[PDB]
Design a protein around this motif. Structure first.
Motif, PDB file in Angstrom:
ATOM      1  N   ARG B  61       0.814  -1.242   0.000  1.00  0.00           N
ATOM      2  CA  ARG B  61       0.000   0.000   0.000  1.00  0.00           C
ATOM      3  C   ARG B  61       0.839   1.280   0.000  1.00  0.00           C
ATOM      4  NH1 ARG B  61      -3.147  -1.795  -1.669  1.00  0.00           N
ATOM      5  NH2 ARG B  61      -3.096   0.129  -2.895  1.00  0.00           N
ATOM      6  N   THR B  64      -0.159   3.716  -2.664  1.00  0.00           N
ATOM      7  CA  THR B  64      -1.460   4.301  -2.617  1.00  0.00           C
ATOM      8  C   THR B  64      -1.263   5.830  -2.621  1.00  0.00           C
ATOM      9  OG1 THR B  64      -1.916   2.596  -1.019  1.00  0.00           O
ATOM     10  CG2 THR B  64      -3.718   4.265  -1.455  1.00  0.00           C
ATOM     11  N   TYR B  66      -2.233   9.045  -1.066  1.00  0.00           N
ATOM     12  CA  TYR B  66      -2.760   9.577   0.194  1.00  0.00           C
ATOM     13  C   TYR B  66      -2.825  11.099   0.153  1.00  0.00           C
ATOM     14  CZ  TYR B  66      -3.395   5.735   3.316  1.00  0.00           C
ATOM     15  OH  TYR B  66      -3.849   4.597   3.809  1.00  0.00           O
ATOM     16  N   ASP B  72      -0.014   8.646   6.146  1.00  0.00           N
ATOM     17  CA  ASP B  72       0.327   7.498   5.338  1.00  0.00           C
ATOM     18  C   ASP B  72       1.081   6.565   6.226  1.00  0.00           C
ATOM     19  OD1 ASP B  72       1.302   5.685   3.334  1.00  0.00           O
ATOM     20  OD2 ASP B  72       1.244   7.346   1.938  1.00  0.00           O
ATOM     21  N   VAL B 186      -9.604   3.410   1.048  1.00  0.00           N
ATOM     22  CA  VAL B 186      -8.805   3.422  -0.142  1.00  0.00           C
ATOM     23  C   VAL B 186      -9.652   2.762  -1.208  1.00  0.00           C
ATOM     24  CG1 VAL B 186      -6.980   2.156  -1.300  1.00  0.00           C
ATOM     25  CG2 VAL B 186      -6.484   3.481   0.822  1.00  0.00           C
ATOM     26  N   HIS B 188      -9.674   0.913  -4.808  1.00  0.00           N
ATOM     27  CA  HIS B 188      -8.734   0.065  -5.565  1.00  0.00           C
ATOM     28  C   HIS B 188      -9.204  -0.284  -6.954  1.00  0.00           C
ATOM     29  CE1 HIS B 188      -6.754  -1.312  -1.769  1.00  0.00           C
ATOM     30  NE2 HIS B 188      -7.975  -1.477  -1.288  1.00  0.00           N
ATOM     31  N   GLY B 208      -4.287   2.515  -6.255  1.00  0.00           N
ATOM     32  CA  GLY B 208      -4.868   2.646  -4.913  1.00  0.00           C
ATOM     33  C   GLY B 208      -4.807   4.111  -4.520  1.00  0.00           C
ATOM     34  N   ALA B 210      -6.346   6.877  -1.497  1.00  0.00           N
ATOM     35  CA  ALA B 210      -6.919   6.994  -0.183  1.00  0.00           C
ATOM     36  C   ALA B 210      -7.779   8.262  -0.068  1.00  0.00           C
ATOM     37  CB  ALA B 210      -5.824   6.924   0.896  1.00  0.00           C
TER      38      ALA B 210
END
Lengths: 221, 221, 220, 221
Positions: B61, B64, B66, B72, B186, B188, B208, B210
């Motif tokens: 992750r 991802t 953020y 994070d 999150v 996906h 991904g 968030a």
């Protein structure tokens, strides 16, 4: 159709929770196309309810969802005949709730006949000790299964002192009429208790739903 | 430490219905825009008798996106890293238990993966390779015991439009103290971009991002 | 071939909540009575930072007493052997997945196990080591896709009152086609008979007798 | 000793299963200390039932259980007052049944009123297609949690063709006065319908139920 910018709502719920019976009625109003609504509720039997009112709240209508035009709206299409639903809520401490509700339309008023059963809540847990503050907002996935629409959500209650008590939601919605069926998708929800007396005999409840697809665009073709 | 572009290396040892395999992969991503790609190769137990879709989410992750107003958890885990433990429960009793250690060295994350899939029915869509892809999903994250927990109601589009459903629970475990975020989501999307006939060779993609809920709180102000 | 008296050889590779370990053991048993004994030592990972109780059932239904009228799926599977694959789902969502291959090399059996446990809440009764014993248990076994499934409602007795629950679902695998048993049960009891406060060293005993129900049918 | 070698039984059931209401009534007799009873049943309203009747049968009383001397009967000691129980039946096919029962005594004849809620049973399902022959004999394990008597069972319905439709039973038992609770133990169960008419409106039911600890004696006692 027959649904408008503003609609009225009438709710009638009976249930049982850990051996405690209660009935609750409400009168409310909302905007189907904007997917918001408010409901005024009254406890008619069983006051003072000895469990967190929050387990009831999502029981107390997906016609109040904002559905982009690119996604068939199962719910608005289902009317006038209407639609019913069935739900299981399984909490992480094995509390469990099963729930059935019929959604009709008379005039501009949706009426909701709801039966609500709850069980196995530990006497010293967040539900019977009322330590819930609210449901985190949530995302529900909606898929077809047998021509029914079925939705699942990982929900969490925010507790006194931060951190969460989870429960899984499975809902099955059933039109009383042939309707164009949607693709796989989601509903972003926020449910809220606006105002309530200290004992919850009166509670003003609010709900926002918006349908979508994912916002991450596919690499596929 | 964590640069706009980074490499990735994966080693996975697995066993699914008493069949072992080993897979190596190498790729790259943009940790901050939460996209990444991966080339996978079966180095043992080729060819796999079961749908590759069960493996893909096991193969960080850190990738991802953020927003700056969400901590994070993952990036923060570094230099040292974090590990993760996951259950996948399939609607037909198929279970995988999965664990991954994530260390950084150079510009390249290295992911060491143990993947145990059990109990898939012989004539289910897993052993009969009847799944097409994961529908994109929404994971919800929370703190519990100072670790971070993600839950997702997953679903596989089958051949013929139906879905095969799976719940996901991942506990992520930073190997140092970091700043813990508020309850969030999150979104996906995972996709296999290319594959050889046996899925002995696979090209995977993940996105991904968030977020909090898009919906305004209406209670008080 | 499976003689009144046998020797057991036991090897286990494992990881629980990240902490890796190897355990080795050797002992003997009376298969046709249902008892056996096992002396275990920890080769890697010691001290194990978790309940040893999770491990003990993953350390052979060959040592079950089976009657005439109940097919003995386990002794029948030899000389070729069997494997099994097990799910343990604990009430706090701690979960384990285990595989063990059961082979014969003359008088000694060699069970080679992979144990994997994960998601044990760091403060739960398994990581905090608050479990005294497995209760005694009863496993229902039935056929589904040609193979033999066991289910057991398990429970560990906890430090000062309290039971911590675990569902066991095992699927067993013949290394031959054997005769397929009808639905039936196997009563169980396992016990640590001695140990060093770290469980570097342990003595372990299992009993168990396969049966049908002790209640008669009124069906006509 | 208020309870006799011989007692009568009143049994009254209302319930839903997939959206089909019913009301079932039965009269029967049995022997408390031997573990055996019998029961004759009319499907009062809802006939013919559209589902298998076995799903009902364990809800149509653990008094009728042979409790040895060294395990206090949780169930018989519960009276004069009475007791209740809550039960989930989670079938492998995800049909769910949630059940509350209320058990009284006036004169020689125990009263059972049952709330049967049944949910999510497939349309090509065993319970909807009426494909069930009987329950296999069972062994429940029973323990204390929160000073309530909890029991777990791995049950299995045999199906035309052999083979088996599994269901996990957890029932939590609730005495209305403060009894002394037994330690960990087991009940062996056998439940049998003794005869039925084609649609099953008429039925006689027979259960036999013995309590015990583990036969095996202790190596370390």
């Amino acid at each position: 159709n027959l649904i408008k910018e503003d609609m009225r709502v009438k709710v009638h719920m009976e249930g049982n929770v850990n051996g405690h019976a209660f009935v609750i009625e409400g009168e409310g109003k909302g905007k189907p196309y904007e997917g918001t609504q408010t409901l005024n509720l009254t406890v008619k039997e069983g006051a003072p309810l000895p469990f967190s009112y929050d387990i009831l709240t999502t029981a107390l209508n997906r016609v109040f969802t904002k559905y982009p035009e690119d996604i068939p709206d199962y719910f608005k299409q289902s009317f006038p005949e209407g639609y019913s639903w069935e739900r299981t809520m399984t909490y992480e401490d094995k509390g469990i709730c099963t729930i059935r509700s019929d959604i009709s339309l008379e005039g501009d008023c949706f009426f909701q006949n709801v039966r609500f059963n709850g069980m196995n809540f530990p006497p010293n847990g967040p539900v019977m000790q009322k330590k819930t503050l609210k449901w985190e907002p949530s995302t529900e996935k909606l898929h077809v299964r047998d021509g029914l629409l079925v939705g699942n959500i990982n929900m969490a209650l925010l507790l006194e002192g931060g951190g969460h008590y989870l429960c899984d939601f499975k809902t099955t919605y059933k039109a009383k009429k042939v309707v164009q069926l949607p693709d796989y998708h989601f509903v972003d929800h926020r449910i809220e208790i606006l105002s309530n007396d200290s004992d919850y005999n009166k509670v003003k409840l609010y709900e926002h739903g918006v349908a979508r697809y994912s916002p991450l665009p596919s690499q596929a073709w």
